[PDB]
């Protein structure tokens, strides 16, 4: 059934599994027309299909041409998400296929179940966790590859960089979700924190800065403050 706070450690066991987040698949800007009506212009999007045990973010870039001449795009986006996830499970050799796919939004369940009928042994699960994966497009290197794409493309990022050399998957996922929740609540502040000090750099092959263990503790504390801060700025506490 559903994945929640009670069964949180299941994410880090030795079944291969993928979180699928569809919140950035269909992206638009809303604007006025010359006649004063409103219209949308789609921009490139992405499916966020992440591996909890290694930090690998398997980003399928959704190019705006996939919407051309289509209707009911928010509904189609869920089916396109499911089609592309299914195509990834099939490309994979068998021992590498995930065992479970957890969707971050319940509206993805039926589309994914239908597309995965050929895989009756892969469990399709919802979650009660409010995961901040929508903020993935606040990671500069991910946003850049999505916006630059001229055609459909699959581009990967171990989203944990090299953290697993020093920390466990549980701790890596907790750091990732803290960083992303921060970026989601106040992207400017969050990014200031991450880049305030010009001596800590992001390696060319990484997404996040090369913080020491001690610096990560400082960073992580600042992100908690920012989140608590914004939670006061928001509710006046």
């Amino acid at each position: 059934g559903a994945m929640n706070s009670s069964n949180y450690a299941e994410l880090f066991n030795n079944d291969i599994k993928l979180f699928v987040d569809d919140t950035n698949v269909y992206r638009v800007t809303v604007h006025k027309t010359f006649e004063g009506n409103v219209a949308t212009k789609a921009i490139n999007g992405c499916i966020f299909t992440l591996n909890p045990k290694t930090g690998h973010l398997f980003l399928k870039i959704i190019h705006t041409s996939v919407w051309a001449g289509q209707k009911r795009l928010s509904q189609l986006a869920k089916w396109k998400t499911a089609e592309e996830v299914s195509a990834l499970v099939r490309s994979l050799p068998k021992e590498e296929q995930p065992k479970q796919i957890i969707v971050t939004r319940k509206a993805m369940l039926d589309p994914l179940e239908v597309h995965m009928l050929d895989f009756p042994n892969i469990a399709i699960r919802p979650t009660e966790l409010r995961l901040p994966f929508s903020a993935a497009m606040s990671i500069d290197k991910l946003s850049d590859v999505v916006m630059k794409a001229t055609e459909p493309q699959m581009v990967l990022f171990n989203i944990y960089d090299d953290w697993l050399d020093r920390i466990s998957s549980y701790t890596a996922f907790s750091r990732l979700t803290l960083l992303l929740r921060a970026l989601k609540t106040n992207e400017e502040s969050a990014k200031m924190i991450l880049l305030s000090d010009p001596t800590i750099t992001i390696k060319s092959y990484h997404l996040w800065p090369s913080f020491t263990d001690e610096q990560w503790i400082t960073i992580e504390s600042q992100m908690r403050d920012l989140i608590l801060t914004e939670y006061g700025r928001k509710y006046n506490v």
């Binding site: 189609l76 089916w79 499911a82 089609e83 039926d110 589309p111 179940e113 239908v114 597309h115 009928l117 050929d118």
Partner: protein, 300 residues
Amino acid sequence: MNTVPFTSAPIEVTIGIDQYSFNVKENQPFHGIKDIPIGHVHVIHFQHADNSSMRYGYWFDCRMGNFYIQYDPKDGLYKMMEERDGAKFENIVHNFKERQMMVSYPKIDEDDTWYNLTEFVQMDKIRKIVRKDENQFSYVDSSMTTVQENELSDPAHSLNYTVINFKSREAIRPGHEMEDFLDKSYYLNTVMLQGIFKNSSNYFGELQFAFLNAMFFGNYGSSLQWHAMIELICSSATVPKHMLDKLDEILYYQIKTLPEQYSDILLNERVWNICLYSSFQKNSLHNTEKIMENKYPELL
């Protein structure tokens, strides 16, 4: 006009014959039902006074044999049997009729209710859903499970309704996943109508039989089947016009006959709201929508 004699009535029982019901007292000198209309299937059904658990009954067509009821004190139920000695049967029936020991099938001339509920129901198709080949009539009860229910346990006592499953490879063409799931026309028209049922008459027959088993026996799997067969049509954008018009008449008479007090258990809110208000056919079932809105406006 045919007759189903009873050897006796040793236990107090509510007896149904089609949409009619009457009470018979323990050891009442009652010897059966006469004046049964020829040309339709019929159901004779039972609820014991001492144990309302297990409604049970028999589907039959008097054109296929001479049938009677006899209580079995070992198995504790009224059993239908066939009498092969036609002369014995005629002699028994004539005596019981002469002694006025029969209820008369109480059909009003104006009344087409039973025809309208069984228009497409054929005994030969009932006997393929309910498999007991040595008898010409078919036993059904409240507890019998369906083949689909059993896939999710005695196969010989199962209701072999056609399996309908909207999230199944049978229902969904590879490469048409969104199309087939959101518009079920290919599953309705190609897989089920052309492939399995052969024609809409057989589809409606099974739909009507499922409803009647739900209504008369409280058979939960039959109710599931009836709603699934409605939903499959309502969720298809392309349905022959004669089928939609006939479905509206079918459902109207089913809704008209349903006891007011059983609507809570026999009607699935999601299916009906979806079919009447959101589906492709939300504007194609005028008679059914009108009776539902006037008789069960709470459900909606």
